[PDB]
Amino acid sequence: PQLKGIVTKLYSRQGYHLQLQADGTIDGTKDEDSTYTLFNLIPVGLRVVAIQGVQTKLYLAMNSEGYLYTSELFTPECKFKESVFENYYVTYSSMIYRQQQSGRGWYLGLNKEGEIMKGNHVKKNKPAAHFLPKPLKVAMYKEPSLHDL
Template sequence: MPFFPSRFICVCLHFLVLYFQLQESQQRLADFRLYIENHTRHPEDLSRKQIRIYQLYSRTTGRHVQVLGKKVNANGEDGGQYAVLVVETETFGSHVRIKGMETDHYICMNRNGKIIGKRNGRSQECVFVEEFLENNYTALLSVKYKGWYLGFNRKGRPKKGSRTAQTQQEAHFMKRPPGGTAELPEDFRFTPVTKRTRRAQRLKASSGTH
């Protein structure tokens, strides 16, 4: 008979140990979540960011993304003051916030898919994910609106996010130094093809056959 109480006490002690281990595990998890929040809650804290400065060359226009206050387009000149971008990369992940150095406005995408410049870049609408493509270009995917990319048409005007895709040239960019002195590799040069260009190519090909 004394065996039963002893076994019961051992079982109780065993469950008690498991209970305290579970409590300790939950506390560690809570501490870790608090640590993550403290490192991601304040986007203005530059000590927790990697800061880069560069230009974004647009594959569509052959020019650069520029931030003109609330307006954003891809008609910036190489080395232009509005084409110099400050890119803030969070220490956790590849999420970036991009703002114009001259105007101090962030590139953001609203719920309608429209690209606009905002003074305050804390919103998730101003966060993009860098996607590195096989053709050596970079695409910028909206964090808040899945499947929507930063993109510009041939006139340099922003495209609606809902009309973009990673495979479109309108959403392809290349990072360049801000000095305006670096030459583009041949693979990245923007060469507009016109009717005159095609006619000249045909004449050149026909003359070479004689």
Template sequence: MLVIALLLLLSLWDPVSPRPRCASGPACDPRHRRDAGGRGGVYEHLGGAPRHRKLYCATKYHLLIHPNGKIDGSLDENNPLSIMEITAVDVGVVAIKGLFSGRYLAMNDKGRLYASEVFNKECEFVERIHELGYNTYASRHHSTEHPAAPGGGGSSKRRASAKRQWYVSINGKGRPRRGFKTRSTDKASLFLPRVLGNKDHEMVKRLRESPGPHHHAHHHSRRAERRRRRHRAGKGWA
């Protein structure tokens, strides 16, 4: 029994890795938070380690996190900016980081999605699994609070329903929707976490071998911006 207990303790041990900057000052890599039971590291119910995935929206766009702070979607499944590192920060709560941009997905108090350079509370999203394998990601700290019913009557369940969550959402044009306009049942709020393919693994391998970790992302972002400008110029947009 003692040998089994020692083996279990060794299986839970996780070496400390460098932690990214945190908005509050000290290092606070979400992978090193502790849950209510006092266990260190990541959470077993979300795979036990940071997951590399692509978030494919039901509107057929892949979620992108840009180095310049922009969030949108792309129909290009080989875009490196679509490769995410999803890490548990609490039970059912995750942080989503663009592997190539080095930024975290975040939602502010106006319901706008943006890419944060540092991890903060706006980078925390409640992850829930829905039908057909799709997930939703709701802001943990921002939502719509409806006023309580007059007289304060009703059950606690009814009072809880007065709070409407704000979801990560990409519309049919690849643009993010404001959180307060979303619903969990909206097609634009449903995401399928796709495992990486061979091309994706090759890009990740080159990223790790590259002396400049964000070189590929910046290069791709500049090319995409030039294409958008040419497209606007061709249509005579201002």
């Protein structure tokens, strides 16, 4: 009910700011000033976060096929493991889905055109998976109510 999180923008190493538009579409934009680039990064576990669009209140999520989508309710598919990369970047990966052969994780990523990619196509060591967080402020959050899939 009282977790300390952060209000922040997520700047893709690919040159685009992550965005969650009112209609639920997820992509990257250069309109840094867009209110749809603001997210609540709420800890829901050890280096596990929920990524919620501030304006829409929607959570980013990844399904079993690797597609990213927006969820009104906080569910297991809304949890992302946060990992630091090359000191300044962070990567976000699914907590429940990964490659059945190597165990390689599925990640949040934007291509060079600033388009959202399938989680299983995004590799941890590639720029597509790297985000430079640009914090606005620290804030307190009610621990999101967890709902089964």
